[PDB]
Design a protein around this ligand. Sequence first.
Ligand SMILES: *[C@@H]1O[C@H](CO)[C@@H](O[C@@H]2O[C@H](CO)[C@@H](O[C@@H]3O[C@H](CO[C@H]4O[C@H](CO[C@H]5O[C@H](CO)[C@@H](O)[C@H](O)[C@@H]5O[C@H]5O[C@H](CO)[C@@H](O)[C@H](O)[C@@H]5O)[C@@H](O)[C@H](O[C@H]5O[C@H](CO)[C@@H](O)[C@H](O)[C@@H]5O)[C@@H]4O)[C@@H](O)[C@H](O[C@H]4O[C@H](CO)[C@@H](O)[C@H](O)[C@@H]4O[C@H]4O[C@H](CO)[C@@H](O)[C@H](O)[C@@H]4O[C@H]4O[C@H](CO)[C@@H](O)[C@H](O)[C@@H]4O)[C@@H]3O)[C@H](O)[C@H]2NC(C)=O)[C@H](O)[C@H]1NC(C)=O
Ligand SMILES: *[C@@H]1O[C@H](CO)[C@@H](O[C@@H]2O[C@H](CO)[C@@H](O)[C@H](O)[C@H]2NC(C)=O)[C@H](O)[C@H]1NC(C)=O
Ligand SMILES: *[C@@H]1O[C@H](CO)[C@@H](O)[C@H](O)[C@H]1NC(C)=O
Ligand SMILES: *[C@@H]1O[C@H](CO)[C@@H](O)[C@H](O)[C@H]1NC(C)=O
Lengths: 131, 49, 107
Amino acid sequence: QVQLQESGPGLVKPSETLSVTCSVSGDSMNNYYWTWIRQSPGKGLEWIGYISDRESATYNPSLNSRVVISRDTSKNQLSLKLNSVTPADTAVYYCATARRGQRIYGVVSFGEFFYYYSMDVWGKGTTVTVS
Amino acid sequence: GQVFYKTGDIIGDIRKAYCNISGAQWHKVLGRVANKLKEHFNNKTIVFK
Amino acid sequence: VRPLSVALGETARISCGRQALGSRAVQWYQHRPGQAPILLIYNNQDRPSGIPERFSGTPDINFGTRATLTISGVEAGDEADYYCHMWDSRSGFSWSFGGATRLTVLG
Ligand SMILES: *[C@@H]1O[C@H](CO)[C@@H](O[C@@H]2O[C@H](CO)[C@@H](O[C@@H]3O[C@H](CO[C@H]4O[C@H](CO[C@H]5O[C@H](CO)[C@@H](O)[C@H](O)[C@@H]5O[C@H]5O[C@H](CO)[C@@H](O)[C@H](O)[C@@H]5O)[C@@H](O)[C@H](O[C@H]5O[C@H](CO)[C@@H](O)[C@H](O)[C@@H]5O)[C@@H]4O)[C@@H](O)[C@H](O[C@H]4O[C@H](CO)[C@@H](O)[C@H](O)[C@@H]4O[C@H]4O[C@H](CO)[C@@H](O)[C@H](O)[C@@H]4O[C@H]4O[C@H](CO)[C@@H](O)[C@H](O)[C@@H]4O)[C@@H]3O)[C@H](O)[C@H]2NC(C)=O)[C@H](O)[C@H]1NC(C)=O
Ligand SMILES: *[C@@H]1O[C@H](CO)[C@@H](O[C@@H]2O[C@H](CO)[C@@H](O)[C@H](O)[C@H]2NC(C)=O)[C@H](O)[C@H]1NC(C)=O
Ligand SMILES: *[C@@H]1O[C@H](CO)[C@@H](O)[C@H](O)[C@H]1NC(C)=O
Ligand SMILES: *[C@@H]1O[C@H](CO)[C@@H](O)[C@H](O)[C@H]1NC(C)=O
């Protein structure tokens, strides 16, 4: 089963590198992708970077495209390298599941399919705040 | 009285026109055509470009 | 941010305000305040796991129909928010999660 456990420092000084990790237990390598979510400042769900299985970068433009995020799978961690932090993104980070689906409505050979994702299991999260 | 008809926005999904050809039947017909052309062309190897 | 929805356990059926364009792959969600939420449907039809069959979604046949979600027998989970994550071809990669439906109730 999928078990989540957030591990964040909590208190970090501004304009410094960050490192926040989550855990997933008993899971394969390339079965599904990895993502992150933020309900923080009590708003609608906001999307944050979702890395692929090959350490890629295609992230939400609506932050700054600022945070470099997890790839490493040494034993079990997802390390978030956030540089040049600002109080405007004080948040709690949830470690969620990312998977990719495919829907076709025409000729596949014409390059007409789009890619849609689904987020099954989400994490608990640990409150991280800037000073 | 001059009414001009123009293409508006494509409602729904957007698709491109295409034509479907039965591959097996088309290939068989093309092979028969090549075989019948060979006699007219001294049994040369017929190639379509 | 418009206060909306339904209260006091008389039920209804809600639909997000996005117009059905192109091809729709909607995923309803059960909000959970303070902890992990759960998605309701994916592919608009296929039930994720052990979900009661009152949570069905409209089929994508004869395009032109709206995306409607049916509910009844509500818990605090249903009392939480509903989100309309719509996946569409012509809109490209839909970043927005959809409108939020916050259930405000007072006895
Ligand atoms: C010239 O030649 C060309 C050849 O190149 C030819 O191109 C063809 O064009 C037509 C259109 O003109 C194309 O038709 C489309 O085909 C799509 C694909 O169809 C297949 O796949 C779907 C989906 O199946 C996946 O998911 C289900 C459920 O999860 C699984 O059970 C499946 O195993 C499969 O999952 C696999 O794939 C996943 C993704 O990779 C993997 O993750 C997974 O692990 C699996 O590996 C099937 O449903 C289809 O089955 C239907 O057809 C078979 C064979 O006839 C029937 O036996 C069966 O009963 C079904 O009828 C098929 O296998 C279609 O998705 C697409 O249809 C959708 O849209 C139309 C509207 O346009 C709807 O009416 C229709 O219902 C479909 O909507 C469903 O799906 C969406 C999105 O998923 C849902 O949101 C929606 O609610 C709806 O779900 C409901 O209906 C389903 C229908 O059965 C049902 O299964 C659901 O459970 C639910 O009830 C459309 O028809 C075709 O692809 C082109 N072919 C090629 C090769 O390009 C061209 O036409 C020719 N020209 C002329 C003029 O002839
Ligand atoms: C071509 O461009 C014009 C102008 O950008 C588009 O007209 C706009 O259409 C939208 C809705 O389709 C309206 O909300 C705007 O008010 C229109 N603006 C003007 C100036 O007319 C037109 O739709 C475009 N063509 C297509 C096929 O999309
Ligand atoms: C074209 O349509 C006919 C009948 O509608 C069908 O028998 C035939 O297989 C179609 N052609 C192809 C290439 O599928
Ligand atoms: C072409 O036709 C002639 C006459 O029937 C025949 O002798 C010849 O072998 C044919 N060519 C080939 C390559 O078979």
